[PDB]
Amino acid sequence: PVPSRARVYTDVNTHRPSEYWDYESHVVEWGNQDDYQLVRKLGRGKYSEVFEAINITNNEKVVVKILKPVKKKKIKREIKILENLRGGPNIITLADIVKDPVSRTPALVFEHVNNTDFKQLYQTLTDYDIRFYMYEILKALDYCHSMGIMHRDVKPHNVMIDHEHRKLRLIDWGLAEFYHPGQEYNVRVASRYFKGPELLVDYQMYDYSLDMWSLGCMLASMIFRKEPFFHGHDNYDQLVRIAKVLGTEDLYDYIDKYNIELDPRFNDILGRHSRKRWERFVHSENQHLVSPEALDFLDKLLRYDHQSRLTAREAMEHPYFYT
Amino acid sequence: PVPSRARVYTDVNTHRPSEYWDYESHVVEWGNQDDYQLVRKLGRGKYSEVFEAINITNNEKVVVKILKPVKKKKIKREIKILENLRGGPNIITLADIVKDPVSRTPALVFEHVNNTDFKQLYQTLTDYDIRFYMYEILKALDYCHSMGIMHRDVKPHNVMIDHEHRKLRLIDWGLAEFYHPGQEYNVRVASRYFKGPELLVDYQMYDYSLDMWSLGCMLASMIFRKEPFFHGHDNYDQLVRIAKVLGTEDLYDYIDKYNIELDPRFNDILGRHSRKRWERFVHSENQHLVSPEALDFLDKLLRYDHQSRLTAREAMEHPYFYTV
Ligand SMILES: Nc1ncnc2c1ncn2[C@@H]1O[C@H](COP(=O)(O)OP(=O)(O)O)[C@@H](O)[C@H]1O
Ligand SMILES: Nc1ncnc2c1ncn2[C@@H]1O[C@H](COP(=O)(O)OP(=O)(O)O)[C@@H](O)[C@H]1O
Ligand SMILES: NCc1ccc(-c2ccccc2F)c(Cl)c1
Ligand SMILES: [Cl-]
Ligand SMILES: [Mg+2]
Ligand SMILES: [Mg+2]
């Protein structure tokens, strides 16, 4: 396959010392979990149990993410990235790293976010709200990208919104990775619906632009009221769902531009598809959220070619954000 | 001790929401320092390293104050105050808040001021320039006081003057605090020479008037060409230097009015001193900067009783500023 590199923040990690990006050598100091009293279960993830808790030293509400010890490399990577981004705009704040004395189970302590339900937000979100929150996500992404980090799991469940306070936080940095130009990465990242064409075709030399595809999927789902927007039933079917909207023409142009070898399992399912017009998705139920600005912006995010997608900083200058 | 409150802007913070003054709960969003290239060291403070820098996105000169991390409460307090005062007249502008990706050291980014040397300014200032710059400082103080903030470190080193452009900025908001009536504050603030009598006698219920005393010290040092004007060698000696000018009689009236208890360490050093006439500091080298209006104005700033000092807004109406 043809090599590729990010169009922005290409060499930010190459120009930094090993200690910034080498998480395998990073020393993690695990505090005592006795300083935290667990209150109630908030959620349950892939390899974690999330609780609301009270810091008994200052009477402050926190969130404790108890981790199921999978590769220690993965835990170290999540801690290092959270420490590098600590304080960044709309990035969840890692407040502490603790271990329970008896269980020895790792636990990450975060600032508490009073999260508004996805279904509840879906019904009450106006055109202005979508522009406002989309801008807040772009701040978090331009920041973590400037810090040489790819989130690689952008989706509505990894975006905490406290609608009352108009507070947004990008969470779940468990799949995040340091961008090194020319590096070949694992393509089994992101959630199915938000996976970029680059991951589905097994093109390993991807970058920050992966996050811009996932963000495009979120925007299309919100303005068109169709969640998820690309509803694959598996990873191969996921590419077919995309192909049914952006066509097999641009798809073959993309695979030819980067000299990508398609898996044989794609022959009997891919077929031939024309490129759709973003206007067909407009209906009576979503017309109040759609605008020529929103369609032009979406068109510039949902592109097969990862190099042709808007960067987070370019996306922030788009006329769609005149608010 | 007898309670005291400011005569101006007394309740401005009590009538505001907690968001304005609760700095401990304020959320700080730390940008990326990669947008700034450091050029040279400009100064080094008690807990900061100050650099001239270039914003590489617009090729603009800025100042980057690298903070030696003391209590994070103090950094949060300085950021919140700078954000509340951002845009105010003659207040340094906080342009950005950033952290170095590797070091994770907090840094504040300010507008650049091309500061004229204290010694160079001291040699070239005329009666007019002093009245002019004194007025510019009063705008910054009346403004921050109206915003419920006490600077608490007013001195010539915290006042940037670009004499070529007649540009003045009040900097270093690291000791600044929100005024809450009846609150007892830490008296270990301001620089020795500029400490008001209220701090030296350990009277904790002070206000904005502290800033007016420090401004009076700056005015006396400029018009009389004696820097510092009250040259203490320690905090107790600092009160003795003041008493040698204002006299011990008004000092005892001040502590009696507020029922303050003097520290026993003041007994063998304070002595007895008469109040000196301000005209006694006039000499051949400073008479071109002295006038009856300047002496009357100074007399109304350099008062033991913090309540009897002119407020910044009253100070602006004084005949000393007829020229401006
Ligand atoms: N800061 C937070 N405030 C409130 N709830 C949170 C916070 N962080 C995580 N959660 C909750 O925990 C769930 C899972 O957390 P997450 O970090 O995404 O881990 P996982 O990768 O195991 O799913 C989220 O969907 C959310 O409901
Ligand atoms: N905006 C500025 N422009 C130019 N010089 C400045 C500016 N801000 C600070 N400095 C320089 O840096 C020095 C120290 O800055 P300061 O804010 O007073 O920090 P500290 O609280 O640590 O003493 C100043 O005395 C001055 O020489
Ligand atoms: N940066 C050194 C400096 C030098 C002189 C002054 C000054 C000017 C006019 C009146 C009173 C003054 F003390 C100031 Cl504010 C600062
Ligand atoms: Cl009173
Ligand atoms: Mg200073
Ligand atoms: Mg400063």
Coordinates of C-alpha atoms in Angstrom, one line a residue, chain A residues 22-30 76 79-80 83:
Chain A
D22 CA 6.5 6.4 25.7
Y23 CA 3.7 5.1 27.9
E24 CA 5.4 1.7 28.5
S25 CA 8.2 3.5 30.5
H26 CA 5.8 6.0 32.3
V27 CA 5.7 5.5 36.1
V28 CA 2.2 5.4 37.4
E29 CA 1.7 6.2 41.1
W30 CA -1.5 4.4 42.4
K76 CA -0.7 2.7 31.1
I79 CA -3.4 7.0 32.0
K80 CA -0.5 8.7 30.1
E83 CA -2.3 13.0 32.0

